[PDB]
Structure 1
């Protein structure tokens, strides 16, 4: 089965409010095979306090994962989602903007 590259979509639960509790989400879907590295980044650094769904697949059998973490944004801090796959030469990044 032809390798499929992940689609990465990054979005927040609430409007960005500097100094307010909020949730950052990263939805990664449509990839095959199942081995993958997803991380949520705060200032280029991997966040450890994270939650993810158990591995699941659609009907075309490609896989998908939801990641999220609770966080409080400020002008200084930027957040991201980084993904590494076999179909990825370099770890792809997607950045979150207010």
Structure 2
């Protein structure tokens, strides 16, 4: 039907605590989930044990989907969500801000 770039929300489950355990969420929405790739990055490197919800979709194949992993944020640690999709020339990276 229509081609649009996927939108990314990056936030933590509980508010950020340095040292104390948490979860990092990446909520991805858009059209046509044609083998979409989603990664969570720890200082630019892929995080191994990431999990995801089932993919939700409607009749026109608009979709949403949640990726998450258990983590403990620290001082010199930055996190991001990377998405690869057919509408994108280059993978989009969204920084987590806490």
Structure 1 residues 50-59 or 15-24, which shifts more?
50-59
CA contact (8 A) 2:30 2:63 kept: yes
Post-superposition Cα deviations, 1:31-78, rounded to whole Å, max 9, x if no partner, equal 324221100000111111111012221354212210000100111111
Where in structure 1 are there 5+ consecutive unaligned residues?
none
Secondary structure of 1:60's aligned partner: coil
TM-score (norm 2): 0.90
Where in structure 2 are there 5+ consecutive unaligned residues?
none
Q: Aligned in 2, Cα 1:72/1:60: closer, same or farther, shift over 3 Å?
A: same
Displaced runs of 4+ in structure 1, greater than 3 A? none
Secondary structure of 1:38's aligned partner: strand
Structure 1 residues 32-41 or 71-80, which shifts more?
32-41
TM-score (norm 1): 0.90
The root-mean-square deviation of aligned C-alpha atoms, in Å, is: 1.3
